[PDB]
A paper describes a structure:
The inhibitors of HIV-1 protease (PR), an essential enzyme that cleaves gag and gag-pol polyproteins into mature functional proteins, are the key element of effective cART1,2. In the present studies, we designed and synthesized seven novel PIs that incorporate the unique 6-5-5 ring-fused crown-like tetrahydropyranofuran (Crn-THF) as a P2-ligand as in GRL-142, GRL-121, GRL-001, and GRL-003.
The transition state hydroxyl group of all the PIs examined forms two hydrogen bonds with each of the catalytic aspartates, Asp25 and Asp25′; and on the opposite side, with the so-called “flap water” coordinated by the main-chain amide N-H groups of Ile50/Ile50′. However, no definite difference was observed between the potency of the mono-meta-fluorine-containing inhibitor group (GRL-001, GRL-002, GRL-014, and GRL-015) and the mono-para-fluorine-containing inhibitor group (GRL-003, GRL-004, and GRL-011). No major difference in cell permeabilities was observed when the fluorine was at the meta- or para-position. Of note, both isopropyl and cyclopropyl groups protrude at the edge of the S2′ site pocket where they heavily interact with the side chain of Lys45′ and to a lesser extent with Ile47′, Asp29′ and Asp30′ of PR. From a structural point of view the isopropyl moiety containing a wider C-C bond angle and two extra hydrogen atoms apparently fits well into the entrance of the binding pocket. Benzothiazole-containing inhibitors performed overall better in their antiviral activity compared to benzoxazole-containing inhibitors. Cyclopropyl-containing inhibitors exerted greater antiviral activity than isopropyl-containing inhibitors.
Numbering used by the authors:
A (entry chain A), B (entry chain A): 1 to 99
């Protein structure tokens, strides 16, 4: 799809058997999702944003289907206010900015 | 330009007579710039992000030239870690996401 930016660029994702909405976020290096149940091993990580830092769990080689396109990569899980799809996964679905 | 997302989507901006770099950020509703000298009246505002909230100064009808495209709108100035161009200005330069 082409997506204009008059509204938040939200898409449906399927991850860990669950359906969620997430923001396509070109300002995010990495993918950060709200607390959710994910299977397997993880590693503690601190990440920074506009108002300071949060502690997240780092999960590698996680499958995510983003608006019907499959990607596999790192997902960070923690107290983010919104689910964010970052460039680590946007590059896999072929996402570009155009003006 | 078409911009792929293997690197941060940074562009040159000119605002308040100054040259700066800023991130084209589809996950940002509003435009937030690092402390800088802007002329005229402003209004206190608190905005929230990944790690909590920051106090910004709200400036309206500010001219910004974003990668050679002119836009006029609200700019928030405050302790953001990075200069962010949000959807309020991305819609004016015709920016879209495509996959
Ligand atoms: C969380 C997200 C929903 C909104 N944020 C835009 C994201 O793109 C921000 C932009 C950004 C902020 C700080 C920073 F150091 C680097 C980049 N990205 C973000 O938090 O990403 C984090 C995390 C993602 O992976 C890595 O890449 C950058 C770091 C790092 C951890 S925001 O907090 O910066 C933001 C920006 C503009 C806004 N305008 C508003 N307006 C409200 C009044 C609605 O809220 C805003 C909130």
């Amino acid at each position: 799809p082409q997506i204009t930016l008059w509204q938040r660029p939200l898409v449906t994702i399927k991850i860990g058997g669950q359906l969620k909405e997430a923001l396509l976020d070109t300002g995010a290096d990495d993918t950060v999702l709200e607390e959710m149940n994910l299977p397997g091993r993880w590693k503690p990580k601190m990440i920074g944003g506009i108002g300071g830092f949060i502690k997240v769990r780092q999960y590698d080689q996680i499958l995510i289907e983003i608006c019907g396109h499959k990607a596999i990569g790192t997902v960070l899980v923690g107290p983010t206010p919104v689910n964010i799809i970052g460039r680590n996964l946007l590059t896999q679905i072929g996402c570009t900015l155009n003006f």
